[PDB]
Paper text:
The novel approach in the present work to structural studies of the baseplate became possible with a bchK mutant of Cba. tepidum that forms modified chlorosomes, termed carotenosomes, with a fully functional baseplate formed by CsmA protein and BChl a pigment but lacking self-assembled BChl c antenna elements. Hence, by combining all types of experimental constraints: local high-resolution structural information from solid-state NMR, orientation between BChl a pigments from isotropic and anisotropic CD, LD, ab initio calculations, and global structural information from cryo-EM, together with the symmetry information, it was possible to derive a unique and precise structure for the CsmA-BChl a baseplate. CD spectra analysis and ab initio calculations demonstrate that the basic building block of the baseplate structure is a symmetric CsmA dimer, which is translated along two perpendicular directions to form a two-dimensional lattice structure. In accord with indications from earlier studies, the CsmA monomers form helical structures with a slight curvature. The data presented here reveal that the helices form rods by head-to-tail translational association in a tight interface allowed by the small amino acids of in particular G15, G39 and A12 flanked by other relatively small polar amino acids such as T8, S35 and N46. The helices are amphipathic leading to formation of a hydrophobic and a hydrophilic interface. The hydrophilic interface pairs the side of the helices with electrostatic interactions through oppositely charged side-chains. The hydrophobic interface is further stabilized by symmetry-related packing of aromatic rings of F7/F7* and F18/F18* and clustering of other hydrophobic residues. The BChl a ligand coordinates to the side-chain of H25 and form pairs, which are almost co-planar orthogonal to the plane of the baseplate and with the centres separated by ca. 15 Å along the rod axis.
Author numbering:
A (entry chain F), B (entry chain D), C (entry chain K), D (entry chain I), E (entry chain E), F (entry chain A), ...: 1 to 59
The structure:
Amino acid sequence: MSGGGVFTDILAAAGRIFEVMVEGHWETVGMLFDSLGKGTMRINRNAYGSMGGGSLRGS
Amino acid sequence: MSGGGVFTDILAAAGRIFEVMVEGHWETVGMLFDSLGKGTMRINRNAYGSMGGGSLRGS
Amino acid sequence: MSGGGVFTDILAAAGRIFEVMVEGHWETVGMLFDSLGKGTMRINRNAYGSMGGGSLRGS
Amino acid sequence: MSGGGVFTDILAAAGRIFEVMVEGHWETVGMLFDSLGKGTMRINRNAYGSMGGGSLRGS
Amino acid sequence: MSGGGVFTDILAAAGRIFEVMVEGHWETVGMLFDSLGKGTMRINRNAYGSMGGGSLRGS
Amino acid sequence: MSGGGVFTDILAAAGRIFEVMVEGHWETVGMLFDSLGKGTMRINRNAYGSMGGGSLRGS
Amino acid sequence: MSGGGVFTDILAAAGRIFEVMVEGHWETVGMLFDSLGKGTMRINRNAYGSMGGGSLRGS
Amino acid sequence: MSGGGVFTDILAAAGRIFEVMVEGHWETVGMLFDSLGKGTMRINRNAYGSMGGGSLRGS
Amino acid sequence: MSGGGVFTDILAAAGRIFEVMVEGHWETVGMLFDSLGKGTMRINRNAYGSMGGGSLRGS
Amino acid sequence: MSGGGVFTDILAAAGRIFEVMVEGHWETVGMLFDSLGKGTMRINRNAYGSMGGGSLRGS
Amino acid sequence: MSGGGVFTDILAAAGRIFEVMVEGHWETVGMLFDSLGKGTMRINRNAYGSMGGGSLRGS
Amino acid sequence: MSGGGVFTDILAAAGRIFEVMVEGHWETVGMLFDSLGKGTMRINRNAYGSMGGGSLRGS
Amino acid sequence: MSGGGVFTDILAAAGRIFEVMVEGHWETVGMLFDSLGKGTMRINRNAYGSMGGGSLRGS
Amino acid sequence: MSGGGVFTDILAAAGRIFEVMVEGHWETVGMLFDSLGKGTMRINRNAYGSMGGGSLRGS
Ligand code: BCL
Ligand code: BCL
Ligand code: BCL
Ligand code: BCL
Ligand code: BCL
Ligand code: BCL
Ligand code: BCL
Ligand code: BCL
Ligand code: BCL
C-alpha cells in the first residue's frame, strides 16, 4: 500500500482551504449599510430648523 | 529425514513477518480526524461575536 | 404684464414632479435584505441535528 | 436610474447558489467510517473462540 | 456708486467657499488608525495560547 | 489634494500583509520535537527486559 | 520560505531509521551460548557412572 | 554524517535576522502624529482672543 | 583450530566501534533549541513598554 | 613375545596427548564476554545524567 | 539657514549605529570557556576508578 | 572583525582532540603484567608435591 | 636473552618524554585573560566622571 | 665399566648451570616500575597549587 496516500489529506485541505475563501468573504458587507448615512442629512437641514415646540394650542 | 526442514520455520515466519505489515498499518489514521479542526473556525468567528447573553426577556 | 406667467407653476411642478422620482426610488430596497434568508440554512442543518441537550456533566 | 439594477440580486444569488454547493458537499462522508467495520472481524474470529472464562486460579 | 459692488460679496464667499474645503478635509483620517487592528492578532494567536494561569508557585 | 493618497493605505497594508508571512511561518515547528520519540525505544527494549526489581540485598 | 523544508524530517528519519538496524542487530546472540550444552555430556557420562556415594571411610 | 549540518543555523538565522527587519520597521511612525500640531493653531488664534468670559446674562 | 579466530574480536569491535558513531552523534542538538531566544525580543520591546499596571478600573 | 609391545603405551599417550589439546582449548573464551562491556556506556551517558530523583509527585 | 542641517542627526546616529557593532560583539565568547569541559574527563576515568575510600590507616 | 574567528575554537579542539590520543593510550598496559602468570607454575609443579607437613621434629 | 631489551625503556621514555610536551604546553594561557584589562577603561572614563552621589531625592 | 661415566656429572651440571641463566634473568625488572615516577608530576603541579582548603561552606 506504500504510496498513493492522497485521500486523508484532501479533508485536511477542504477544511484548511475553505479558510481562505470564507475569510475574504466578509470584508465586502462592512461599508454597504454604513456609507449611506450622510445623504439623508441635507433634506433634514432645510425644511426643518425650529426645534422649539412652542406653546400648546388651546392652552 | 535430514535436510528438508522448512515447515516449523514458516510458523515462526507467519507470525514474525506479520509484525512488519501490522506495525506500518496504523500510522495512516493519526492525521485523518485531527487536521480538520481548523476549518470550521472562520464561520464561527464572524456570525457569532457577542458572548454577552444579555438580560432575560420578560424580566 | 399679460402672458409670461411661467414662474409660479414651476413650484407646482417641482413639488408635483418630485412625486414621480421619489415614488419609484423606494421599490429597489425591499428584496435586498429578505432574499438572503435561504443561504444560511444548509450549514445550520448538517453540522447540527441533536436538539437533545442531554444530561448535565457532573450531575 | 432605470435598469442597471444587477447588484441586489448577487446577494440573493450568493445566498441561494451556495445552496447547491453545500447540499452535495456532504454525501461523501457517510460511507467513509462505516465501510471498514467488516475487515476487523476475521482476525477476531480465529484467535478468540472460548468465551468460557473458566475457574479462577488459586480458588 | 452704482455698479462695481464686488467687495461685500467676497466676505460672504470667503466664508461659504471655505465650507467646501473643510468638509472634504476630514474623511481621509477615518481609516488611518482603524485598519491596522487586524495585523497584530497573528503573533498573539501563536506564542500565546494557554490562558490558564495555573497554580501559584511556592503555594 | 486630489488623488496621490497612497500613504495611509500602506499602514493598512503593512499590518494586513504581515498577516500572511506570520501565519505561514509557525507551521514548520510542530513536527520537529515530536517525530523523535520512536527512535529511543529499541535500545530501551533489549537491555532492560526485567521489571521485577526482586528482593533487597542484605534483607 | 516555500519548499526546502527537508531538515525537520531527517530527525523523523534517523530516529525512525535506526529502528531497522537495531531491530535486526540482536537476533545474532540467542544461539551463541545455548548450542554448546550438548558437547559437555559425552565426557561426563563415561568417566562418571556411579552415583552411589557408598559408605564413609573410617565409619 | 559529517557536514551537511546547515539546518540548525537557519533557526538561529531566522531568529537573529528578524532583528534587522523589526529594528528598522519602527522609526517611521514617530513623526506621523506629532508633526501636525502646528497646523491647527493659526485658526484658533484669529477667531478667538477674548478669554474674559465676562458677566453672566440675567445676573 | 590454529588461526582463523576472527570471530570473538568482532564483538569486541561492534561494541567498541559503536563508541565512535554514538559519541559524535549528540553534539548536533546543543545549538538547535538555544539560538532562537534572541529573535522574539524585538517585538516584545516595542508594543509593550509600560510595566506600570496603573490603577484598577472601578476602584 | 619379545618386541611388538606398542599397545600398552597408546593408553599412556591418549591420556597424555589429550593434555595438549584440552590445555589450549580454553584460552579462547576469556575475552568473549568481557570485551563487550565498553560499547553500552555511551548511550547511558547521554539520555541519563540527572541522578537527583527530586521531590515525590503529590507530596 | 535652510538646508545644511546634517549635524544633530549624527548624534542620533553614532549612538544608534553603535548598537549594531556592540550587539554582534558579545556572541563570540559563549563557546570559549564551555567546549573544554569534555576533554579532561578521559584521564580522570582511568587512573581514578575506586571511589571507595576504604578503612582508615592506624584504626 | 567578521571572519577570522579561528582562535576560540582550537581550545575546544585541544580539549576534544586530546580525548582521542588519551583513550587509546591505555589498552596496552592490560596484558603486560597479566600474561606472565602461567610461566612460573611448571617449576613449582616439580620440586614440590608433598603438602603434608608431617610430624614435628623433636616431638 | 641477550640484547633486545628495548621495551622496558619505552615506559621510562613515555613518562620522561611527556614531561617535555606538557611543560611547554601551559605557558600559552597566562597572557590571554590579563592583557584585556586596559581596553575597558576608556569608555568608563568619559561617560562617568562624577563620583559624588549627591543628595537623595525626596529628602 | 672403566670410562663412560659422563651421566652423574650432568646433574651436577644442569643444577650448576641453571645458576648462570637464572642469575642474569632477574636484573631486567628493577627499573621497569621505578622509572615512571617522573612523568605524573607535571600535570599534578599546574592544575593543583592551592593546598589551603579554606573555610567550610555553610559554616
Ligand atoms: C467530514 C466533513 C467536513 C468536510 C469534508 C470535505 C470533503 C471530504 C471534501 C470537501 C470538499 C469541499 N468542502 Mg468541505 N468539509 C467540511 C466543511 C466545509 C464547509 C463547512 C462550512 O462546514 C464548507 C462549505 C466546505 C467547503 C468545501 C469545498 C471547498 C469543497 C466542495 C467543492 C468545492 O466547492 O470546491 C471548489 C474548488 C476547489 C475544491 C479548489 C480546487 C478546484 C480546481 C480543481 C479547479 C480547476 C483548477 C484549474 C485547472 C487551475 C487554475 C485555478 C486557478 C486559476 C489557480 N467544507 C466538513 C466539516 N469537504 C471536497 C473537496 O475538497 O473537493 C474535492 C471533498 O472532497
Ligand atoms: C451578508 C452576509 C451573507 C453573504 C453574502 C455574500 C456576498 C455579499 C457575496 C457572497 C459571496 C459568496 N458567498 Mg456568501 N453570504 C453568506 C452566506 C454564505 C455562506 C455561509 C456558510 O453562511 C457561505 C460559505 C457562502 C458562500 C459564498 C460564495 C459562493 C461566494 C464567495 C466567492 C465564492 O466562493 O464563489 C465562487 C464561485 C462563484 C461565485 C460562482 C461564479 C464563479 C464564476 C464567476 C467563475 C467563472 C465562470 C466561467 C467564466 C464560466 C464557466 C463556469 C462553468 C463551467 C459553467 N455565503 C452570509 C450569510 N456572499 C460573493 C459572491 O457571490 O461572489 C460575487 C459576494 O459578493
Ligand atoms: C483505522 C484503523 C482500522 C483499519 C483501517 C485500515 C485502513 C485505513 C486501511 C487498512 C488496510 C488493511 N487492513 Mg486494516 N484497519 C483496522 C483493522 C484491521 C486489522 C485488525 C486485526 O484490527 C487487521 C489485521 C486489518 C487488516 C488490513 C489489511 C487487509 C489491509 C493492509 C494491507 C493488506 O494486508 O492487504 C493485502 C491485500 C488486500 C488489501 C486485498 C487487495 C489486494 C490487491 C490490490 C492485489 C492485486 C490484485 C490483482 C491485481 C488481481 C488478482 C487478485 C486475485 C487473483 C483475485 N485491519 C483498524 C481497526 N486498514 C488498508 C487497505 O485496506 O488497503 C487499501 C488501508 O488502506
Ligand atoms: C504602527 C505600528 C504597526 C506597523 C506599521 C508599519 C508602518 C507605518 C510601516 C510598516 C512597514 C512594514 N511592516 Mg509593519 N507595523 C506593525 C506590525 C508589523 C510587524 C509586527 C510583527 O508587529 C512586522 C514585523 C511588520 C512588518 C512590516 C514590513 C512588511 C514593512 C517593513 C519593510 C519590509 O519589510 O517590507 C519589505 C517588502 C515590502 C514592504 C513589499 C513591497 C516591496 C517592493 C517595494 C519591492 C520592489 C517590488 C518590485 C519593483 C516589483 C516585483 C516584486 C514581485 C516580483 C512581485 N509590521 C505595527 C503593529 N509597518 C513599512 C512598509 O509597509 O513599507 C513602506 C511602513 O511604512
Ligand atoms: C536529537 C538526538 C536524537 C537523535 C537525532 C539524530 C540526528 C539529528 C541525526 C541522527 C543521526 C543518526 N542517528 Mg540518531 N538520534 C537519537 C537516537 C539514536 C540512537 C540512540 C540509540 O539513542 C542512535 C545510536 C541513533 C543512530 C543514528 C545514526 C543512524 C545516524 C548517525 C550517522 C549514521 O550512523 O548513519 C549511517 C547511515 C545512514 C544515516 C543511512 C544513510 C546512509 C547513506 C547516505 C549512505 C550512501 C547510500 C548510497 C549512496 C546508496 C546505496 C545504499 C544501499 C546499497 C541501498 N540515533 C537521539 C535520541 N540522529 C543523523 C542521521 O540520521 O544522518 C543524517 C542525524 O542527522
Ligand atoms: C520555532 C519558532 C520560532 C521561529 C522559527 C522560524 C523557522 C523555523 C524559520 C523561520 C523563518 C522566518 N521567521 Mg521566525 N521564528 C520565530 C520568531 C520570529 C518572529 C517573531 C516575531 O517571534 C518573526 C515574525 C520571525 C520572522 C521570520 C521570517 C524572517 C522567516 C519567514 C520567511 C521570511 O519572512 O523570510 C523573508 C526573507 C528572508 C528569510 C531573508 C532571505 C531571503 C532570500 C532567500 C531572498 C533571495 C535573496 C537574493 C537571491 C539575493 C539578493 C538579496 C539582497 C539584494 C542582498 N520569526 C519563532 C519564535 N522562523 C524561516 C526562515 O527564516 O526562512 C529560511 C524559517 O526557516
Ligand atoms: C552480543 C551482543 C552485543 C553486540 C554484538 C554484535 C555482533 C555479534 C555483531 C554486531 C554488529 C553490529 N552492532 Mg552490536 N552488539 C551489541 C551492542 C551494540 C549496540 C548497543 C548500543 O549496545 C549497538 C546499537 C551496536 C551496533 C552495531 C552495528 C555497528 C553492527 C550492525 C551492522 C551495522 O550497523 O554496521 C554498519 C557498518 C559497519 C559494521 C562498519 C563496516 C561497514 C563496511 C563493511 C562497509 C563497506 C566499506 C567500504 C567497502 C570501504 C569504504 C568505507 C569508508 C569510506 C572508509 N551494537 C550487543 C550488546 N554487534 C555486527 C557487526 O559488527 O558487523 C559485522 C555483528 O556481526
Ligand atoms: C586553557 C588550558 C587548557 C588547554 C589549552 C591548550 C591550548 C590553548 C593549546 C593546547 C595545546 C595542547 N594541549 Mg591542551 N589544554 C588543557 C588540557 C590539556 C591536557 C590535560 C591532560 O588536561 C593535556 C595534556 C593537553 C594536551 C595538549 C596537546 C594536544 C597540545 C600541545 C601540543 C601537542 O602536544 O600537540 C601535538 C600534535 C597536535 C596538536 C595535532 C596536530 C599536529 C600537526 C600540526 C602535525 C603536522 C600534521 C602533518 C602535516 C599531516 C599528517 C598528520 C597525520 C599523518 C594525519 N591539553 C588545559 C586544561 N592546549 C595546543 C594545541 O592544541 O596545539 C595547537 C594549544 O594551542
Ligand atoms: C603505564 C602508564 C603511564 C604511561 C605509559 C605509556 C606507554 C607504555 C606508552 C605511552 C605512550 C604515550 N604516552 Mg604515556 N604514560 C603515562 C603518562 C602519560 C600521560 C599522562 C598525562 O599521564 C600522557 C598524556 C602521556 C602521553 C603519551 C604519548 C606521548 C604516547 C602515546 C602516543 C603519542 O601521543 O605519541 C605521539 C608522538 C610520539 C610518541 C613521538 C614519536 C613520533 C614519531 C614515531 C613520528 C614519526 C617521526 C618522523 C618519521 C621523523 C620526523 C619527526 C620530527 C620532524 C623530528 N603519557 C602513564 C602514567 N605511555 C606510548 C608511546 O610512548 O609511544 C610508543 C606507549 O607505548
